[PDB]
């Protein structure tokens, strides 16, 4: 409730903390926290600013091969950032696409990453209804491998040059 309020930051930055570390059994425990925080934020940016970007860390830390429920709890991840986003000036330019770069580092090395960018990007749109380094990554990631099947890519990555 209100105590939910006071500790939406901390628990940001308990995902923050045990997130870096979900590579070496914690990272179920992630897709759990995000999984519960689904509906969590759906009956609930100040809390959102800090968890988009905590995620973005976890992406980082291990982006090799991005240790088993950290890598396919990406397209949770992305769904309950666009529950999140849906539901949710300093703090938001510039980090607001580091995560959506983190998931398409690897989206066709792997298209599950692709489906990622293309489930947050619509939340873009949806919380925008209520661009400087982002646009031409996109738009040339969808060039060069409009035929790498690479549709989902392709409409993925058309959705983050508007």
């Known amino acids: 409730y209100f105590l ?5 930051p ?9 997130k870096e570390k979900e590579m070496v059994f914690c990272k179920l425990g992630v897709l759990v926290r995000h999984r519960i925080s689904l509906f969590g934020n759906d009956a609930t940016l100040h ?14 830390g291990l982006e090799s091969v991005k240790f088993l429920d950290n890598a396919a709890e990406d397209l949770e991840k992305t769904m309950e ?3 999140q ?3 949710t000036t300093t703090v938001a ?12 580092g690897q989206h066709q090395f ?3 990453v692709q489906v990622s960018c293309y489930r947050i990007l619509t939340s873009l749109y ?6 400087e380094r982002q646009r031409s990554a996109l738009g040339e990631c969808l060039a060069a491998f409009a035929g790498a099947a690479f549709l989902e890519t392709h409409l993925d990555k058309h959705n983050i040059y508007s």
């Open 10 to 18: 901390l628990c940001s930055g308990g995902h923050a903390s045990n």
């Open 126 to 131: 949806a919380l925008g209804t209520s661009v």
């Open 110 to 112: 792997l298209e599950d």
């Open 93 to 104: 330019l510039l980090p607001m696409l580091s995560s959506l770069f983190e998931h398409i």
């Open 81 to 83: 950032n666009l529950k």
């Open 47 to 60: 809390i959102l600013g800090q968890t988009l970007d905590a995620r973005t860390v976890m992406k980082t």
């Open 85 to 87: 986003g849906q539901f």
């Open 4 to 8: 939910s309020a006071a500790s939406r």
